Amino acid sequence: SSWQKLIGTNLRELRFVFCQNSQRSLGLRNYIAKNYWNLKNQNPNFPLIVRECEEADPYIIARYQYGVEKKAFAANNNEAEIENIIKTLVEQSNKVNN
Amino acid sequence: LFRGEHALRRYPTGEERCIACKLCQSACPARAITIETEPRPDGSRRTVRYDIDMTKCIYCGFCQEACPVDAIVEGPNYEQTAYLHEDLFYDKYKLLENGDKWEPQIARNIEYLINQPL
Amino acid sequence: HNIRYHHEIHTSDQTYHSSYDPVGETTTERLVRYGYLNKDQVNNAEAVAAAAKEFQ
Amino acid sequence: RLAAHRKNDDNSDSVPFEFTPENYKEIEKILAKYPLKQKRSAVMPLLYLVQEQNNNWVPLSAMKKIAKLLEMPEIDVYEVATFYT
Amino acid sequence: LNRMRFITAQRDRSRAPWQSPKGEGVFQGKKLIVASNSPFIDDMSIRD
Amino acid sequence: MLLPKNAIQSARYFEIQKIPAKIAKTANEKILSVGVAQKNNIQPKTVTAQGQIGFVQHPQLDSSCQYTQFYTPQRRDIRGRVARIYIQDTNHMHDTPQIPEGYKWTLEFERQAQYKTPWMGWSFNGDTFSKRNHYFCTLEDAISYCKQMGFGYEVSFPRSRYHTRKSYADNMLWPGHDNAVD
Amino acid sequence: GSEKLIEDRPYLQGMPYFDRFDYVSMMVQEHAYCLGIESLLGTTNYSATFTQIRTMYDELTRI
Amino acid sequence: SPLAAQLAINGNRNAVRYENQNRTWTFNELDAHTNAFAYGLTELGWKAGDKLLLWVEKNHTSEITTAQVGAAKAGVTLVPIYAHSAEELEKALNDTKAKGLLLSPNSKAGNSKYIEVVNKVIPELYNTGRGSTLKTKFANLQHIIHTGFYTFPGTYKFRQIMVYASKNFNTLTLPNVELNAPLFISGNQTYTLKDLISKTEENRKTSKLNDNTPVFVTGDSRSPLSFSLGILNSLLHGNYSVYTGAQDLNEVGQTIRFYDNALLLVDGDIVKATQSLKH
Amino acid sequence: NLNPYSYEALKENHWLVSDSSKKNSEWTHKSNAEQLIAKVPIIYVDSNIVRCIGGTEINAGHPQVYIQLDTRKHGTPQTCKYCGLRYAKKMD
Amino acid sequence: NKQIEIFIDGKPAKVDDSYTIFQACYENGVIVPRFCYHERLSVAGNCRMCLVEVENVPKPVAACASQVVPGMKIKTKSEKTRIHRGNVMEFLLANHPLDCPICDQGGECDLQDISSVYGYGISRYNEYKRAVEDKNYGPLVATSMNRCIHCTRCVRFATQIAGVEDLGKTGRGKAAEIGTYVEKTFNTELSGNVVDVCPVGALTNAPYAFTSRPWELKSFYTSDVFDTLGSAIQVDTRGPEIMRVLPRIHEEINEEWISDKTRHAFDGLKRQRINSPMKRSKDGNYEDIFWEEAIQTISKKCLNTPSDQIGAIIGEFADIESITALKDFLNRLDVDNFEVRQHGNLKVSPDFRANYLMNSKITGVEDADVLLLVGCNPRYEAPVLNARILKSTRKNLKVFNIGTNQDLNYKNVHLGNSTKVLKEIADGTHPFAERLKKAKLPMIMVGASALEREDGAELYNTLKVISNKTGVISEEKSWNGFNILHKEMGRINALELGINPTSVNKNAKLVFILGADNNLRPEDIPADAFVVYFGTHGDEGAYYADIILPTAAYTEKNATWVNTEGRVQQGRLVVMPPGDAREDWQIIRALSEEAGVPLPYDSLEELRYRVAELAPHLLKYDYIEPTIFGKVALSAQQGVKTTLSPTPITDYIDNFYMTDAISRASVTMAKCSTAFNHEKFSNFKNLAK
C-alpha cells in the first residue's frame, strides 16, 4: 500500500532472484506473480528486476542510494512474510541512507 | 650433392621460383625456415618475408629436396663464416643475392642432377 | 600401366594374444570367479555340476 | 563449344529480344502439355521457338525473356540451353 | 639505418595504430573534426 | 575411450566426477558471499561428459594439487591458471581429414603473450607453457589431470550435428495437384 | 632432450636426430630408424634391400 | 483502366527497358510497381490532391517512370523541381506547398548535393525522432523520399515508402483513376490524364509512330513529352520504352543500332524531342 | 592511370591494387622479380590449351600445368600459375 | 521395420530402416570416402567414391545414395571394395590440375586426403590435361575452375541452403563449366559458405588466399559478437596475428553457416586501433600519457563533478562483465542513470528477461507456423536466421510482414509499411487476425531499431495487446511466439543486468563512451563535459572524448555474451590486446579504486560471483534457462498508452559490410562495400523472387 508507493522514493532498485521450481522459492514466486502489476503501476519508474534460476537461493535485494545493497533471504517465506520483508526493506532507507 | 649455403633459386627469366607452398617451412626439421606470404601486387604467390636462421639451420638441404618449383637450393658456397651472430640470420634479399652470385654453378649442378634420373 | 598393385596387399602385421587363467585356480574357484558358482554354494555336487555346465 | 557465354557483343544483354505474337499465341498450346504446377517443362518448346524465330541463334536476351515467362532461374535456362547441342 | 620502418611495417601487419589527430583542428562539439584517410572510395554515397 | 561405461562404477571415481564448491577465502569472496552461495547452489553438482551447460571450477590449491609439476622457484604462476576443456572436432574446410579429429577432448590454456621480436620480426611467446593444447581420452581423465596439476577448469560440452533423414528420393518429391493446392 | 625433440615432430622431421645420437656412426642409426619405420609400416624397403646399399653403408660406418 | 490495355492484352510483352539501369520491365512488372507505390502512398495518408515535388536527377529514369505511374494510378499531383540553389529550392517548396518531396540524395545541387541543400533549407529533419513524424516549418510538407543508399534523418527511402499489397490480407483500397485528375505540372502548365493521352496520340500521329515502334528516351525523363512518348505510349500501345538516363550520345546510337527502327527521344536542355526512326 | 581502390580496378586486378612501378612489391616482397618478369612480352599461342612447366623438361622447372587459352573474351592472355611467363591466343 | 540388422564387414549391427548405407557406416564409426554427398545438402550420385561392394550384389552401390537393406552384408574392407575405390579415385584424378602447391586447399584438401588413403598410389594417364578458365565472382569467392571437379556442391548449396539461384552446370562431356553462365558476383550474405562447400580448391577465401596452410594455424573455438545470434565459430591464428575464422557446427544457433561479417570483419582490429590512452587537448592534440595519470585525472574529475551531472553511453562491444562494472562504478558514486542519449532509446524495461529477449528462440522459427515480422530485415541482419526462416518457409510456414518490402529469398506477404496496418490488426478488424487465430504456432518478431522508435513503448504495448489477443503467447498450447530481434549484444546484456535504458540524463558534465561509436550525434553531448572513451578502434568516440582508454577486443578478453535467444556464450580471449590496452573490467576496477569507491573485484572469479549475486542465470554457460513468468511479463494491461505515429517503419542496416567501428575499419569490409553495394542496391521490389 503506502509502503508500495514509497518504494519509488525509498530505494533505487528492487531485485527478486528466485527459483522457478523450488519450494523455498515457491512463496516468493507466487508473491512476485500475484502482485507484480500493482507495484509496476504505482511505481512505473522504479527498477524492478526479476530473475529465476534452477537452484537459486531466494533473495530480495533492495538497492538504495550510493548503491547500498540490502539483500534479504526469502527462502521458505510465506506471502505475509514476503510482504513484511518488503515493508521492512522499503523502510530501512532512512537508516541506510543516513 | 654438397649441401652448401642455402639460397633462393629462380626461373631463367629471373622471376622468383618460390611459389609460397610452405613446403620448406613444413619440411625444415627444426623449423629453421620462416615464411610470411601475402598476395603480390600483380597477384603472384610470393612471400613478403623469407628468413633462414643459420643459427638454427642445419644446412640439411631438406627444403631443397622437398622444393616444389626448385626454389630453395644448397649452393656450393661453404665459406660462410660470419663475424656477427646477427649477420648470420640471412633473409630474403640476402638469399636472393647469394643465389645471384652462384647461380651458374648451381644451374650446372641442377642440370647434372636432373640428368641422373633422365 | 600396372597401377593396381602399387599398394601392398600383404604386410607382416599379424598379432596373436594368448590368455590363460590362474594355474592354481581350482575349477570350483574358476566357476566362483566367473560367477557360475556361488561363493557359498560350494561342495554341493548338483550345484558344482550346474556351474561347470554353465561355464562350458 | 564454350559452355560459358563468350564475350561477344552480338549476344550481349543489350540485344533486343521480344517474342512474336504468333509465338506468344503458340505458347498457349505448349503450356497445356505440362501441368500448370510445372511450366518449366515447356522450356524445350520455348527454346525451339526461339531458335526458329531468331535466325538459328538464341540470344541471351531471348533466354532472359524465356526465364521471365517460365518463372525459372536464368542460370537454369542457360544450363538447359548449353546442355543440348 | 632503417630498422624503424621495418618495425613499423611488421607492427602494422596486425597491430597498426589508429592515426589520431596531431595539432590544431576544428571541433564539432566535443568531437574533434578530422577527415578520414581511407584509400577506398564509397561510391554509394556519391552516385547520381 | 570417449564415453566410459557408466553402467558400472569403473567408468570413473565418483570423487573425480564431483565439483568442489567455492568457499569464501579472500576478502572479496567474503564480501560477496551470497554470490558464492548462489554459484554453489545453482552450478551442477557433478561433472560428466553427458552434461549440457558449461561449467567453471576454480583452482583448488590444496593437497589434491600435490602432483603439480610447474611450481618452480622462478615460475610461480603456472599452477594457478584455469584452462578451457572442449571437444575440438574436425575443421569445416575438409570433411575427411587424414588425421580425423573429435576422438579426444582438448584442454587448452590461453596464450599469455605473443609478440614479434624485431630482430627478424619473429614470433615469440612470453609463456613457454600452453604452447600446444593437450588431449585427453575421457572428460573424467581431463578433470583428474587438472586436479592433479591443480589447474582450474572451464569445461564446455560440444555441440554436434543432428542426425538427418538422408535419401536421394527427396530430390524428386511430387509437389501435388494445382487445383487442390490453390 | 632428443627424446622429446623427436616426439614433438613428425616422423620425417626427426630424421637427422639419429645421426646426432651416434656421432661416429650416423649410418647405422639411420638404418635402424628406417628398419623400425618399415616394421611399424609392416613392410620392407625392396629397393634398398636389392641395391645392397644399406649393407655397404653399414660396413663403411662400422669401418 | 486506361493503362490496362497492354496489360489485359498479353501481360507478358515487355513494357520498358531501363538501359541506364540495365533493367527490363514488363507490363505486369510496371503495373505491380505502380500498385505498390500507390498502396504505399495511400497507406501513408497521402490523399487525393497531395503534391509530390520531384528533385531527382535524370539518372533515376526507372524511378521517375515508377513514380509517375504510382501518382497517376492513385490520382495525386506531381510537380518536378528544377532547383539549382538553396534559395531556388526554398522558393519552389514555399510556392508549391508539396505534401512530399522526392530527391536524389547524391544529385549535385551546385556546390553541395541535393540532400545537403534540402537540409540547409530544412533543419528540422536533423532533429526528427526515430519512428516519429517530422515537425518542419513548412505548412504542408509531410514526406521526404530520398533516392540515396543511406538513411537520411527526417527522410524515408523510396523502397521503404512503397508497400506491395497482397491479394488476400491487403486492406488499403486504391481510389479509382479519373481522367480529369492533374498529374503533371511542368512549366507552370497543369497537365491532366486526358491532356497527356491527347498529347501522346497527337505526337504519335505527328512523328509517324506505329504500334510496334520502340522509343529510346535518353537523358531527361522529367519532360511531359518524354513521359507521353515513354511509359504512356507503352501503357497505350505496348511500345518498347528504353530509358537511357545520363547516357552518352554514342552509347544511345549503339543501342539504337541494336534496335531496328526506334524513335530517339534525344536529351537536351529543352524538353525532350523526337527524331526519325532507324539511323 | 586509373586511381587504385576503384571498382573498375578491383574488377580488373582480381580485387587487388596492381602496382605499375613495381617498387612497392620490390620493397614488400624484397625483390625486383615482379618488374623483372614484367619485362617479358606477351606470347601468342595457337593451341587453346597449353602445358607450362617454367622450363624445358619435367622436374627441370615447375610441375606441368594446363592453361586454357580459349576463353569468353578473345585475346585475353593468362600468366602461368607456376612460372611468371604469360601466354595468349595466336589470333583470338 | 523398426530395427533392421545388417553386417558391416562381418559385424552385425541393428540400424534404422530409413537410414542410408553411409548413415549406418558413419553411425558405426566406419569412415567411407565421399566427395559429393553433404549431410545438410541434397543427396546426389555425382561422386562414385561411396560406391560400395555389398555381398551377393552385382555392382558397387553408392552408400550415400543407397539405403540399408535388411540382412545386407557390406564388406568395406574387401579387395573388391578397395579396387573399386582405387578405380574411382584414379578416374577422378584424371583431370585434376597440378595446382596443390598453388592452391589454398593444400593441407586440408579432401582430394589429396582420399588420394593418400583410398587412392591407387600412382598415376597412369600420360596425356595433356583439359583446362577451363576461372571465373570472377568478387573478393569473397576465389575461383579456380581448373580444379573444379563439377561436384555440384556450389549449385546444391546455393539452391537449397542460401536460396540464391546463380549456380548451375553449363556444358557437357569433359568441358562442363562449374560456374555461372554470365559474368557476375555472388553476393547473398553467405559467400563464406561457398568456399566451405567446395570439396576442391575451386572455391576459396580470397582474403585468406595464400595466407598460410592448415599446418601453421592454431584454431580456438569461440562465439561471435558481430551478429545478434552469436553463432559458434573457430578462429585459426598464427602467432600474435589472427589468420581467419570458420563456422562451427551449432544446430541450436546457426547450424554450420555464418554471415560474411562474422567471416570477414575480424580484420578490422588489425588497423586503426587504439594501443595507448591518449589525452585530447583543447586544440584537439592527442598526447599519450601513462595510464596512472589518466586514471588519476579521471578519478579527480569524477570526485569534483556532481553526482547528478555524470552520464554515459554503452557500446555495442559491451560484455556482462563490463556492463556490471560500469553499473557498479556508477552506483557506488550514487548515480542511478546509465544512459546519456535521449534519441534512439530502446523502450523496454530490464525488469523481465521474457520481455527483454526473444521468447521463441532460434529453433522457434522452424517450430512456429505463422511468423509476423515488423521492422526486421533478416537478410542483412542475420543471414543464418534468414536461411533458417527460408528453410522453414519451404516446408509448412506462412510469413507476413508489416514493414518495408524486403528482398528475402523466400516469399513473404506484405500487409503494409506504416502503422495503419498495425492499428487495424490491434483493433482486430484485419484479415491477418483470422490467419493468426487459425495458426497452430504463431510468432511475432520485431526489430530492436523498430522498438527504439519514438512510439517505441506505444508500439510495444500495441504488439503485446495483439499477442495476448491473438495467441502468440498461448498458455493452452504453451507456445510463446513473441520474439524481439536485438541489434546490440551490449544492449541485450544491459537488459539482462537490470540497467534501465530509459534512465537518460538530460544534462551531464561527464560523458563516458564504453565502446560506443554508432548512432551518436555531435550535439547529443554538451560541450562543457569531460569525455572519456574506453574503446579499441577510434572512429567517433575517439574524436568525441577528451581522454581515450584503450581496451581489449572480444577476442582479447574472456567475455560473457548473451545471445538474444537466451544463450550464455563464453568468448575466449584468443590473443592479447594491442599495445597497453587494459581490460574493461580491469580499467573499471582501477578507476573505482582511484575514485575512493573500490569495487571488490580482483579476479574474473570474483566478478562472476558478483554477477551471480546480481543475476544467477548468466553463470550457466551454453544454456537457455526457461522463463516461468513469460505470460505475466507479457500480460496485457489496461490504461497503457499505445498511440502510434503514421510514419513508415524501416530497417536500420543500409550497408551490411559497414555497421560498426571494426567493420568500418576492416579493409576487407571496405572492399566488400566498394564492390557489392552498387550491385545489391535496388529501390524496387523483386517480384521474381
Ligand code: SF4
Ligand atoms: S617448396 Fe619452394 S616454392 Fe614451395 S614455399 Fe618452399 S621455396 Fe617456395
Ligand code: SF4
Ligand atoms: S637446409 Fe634443412 S635445416 Fe636448413 S632451412 Fe633447409 S630444411 Fe631447414
Ligand code: SF4
Ligand atoms: S583441389 Fe588443389 S590441393 Fe586439392 S588436389 Fe586439386 S590442386 Fe591439389
Ligand code: SF4
Ligand atoms: S566449383 Fe567446386 S563446389 Fe562448384 S560444382 Fe565444381 S567442385 Fe563443386
Ligand code: FES
Ligand atoms: S558422394 Fe556419395 S553418391 Fe556422391
Ligand SMILES: [Zn+2]
Ligand atoms: Zn610456368
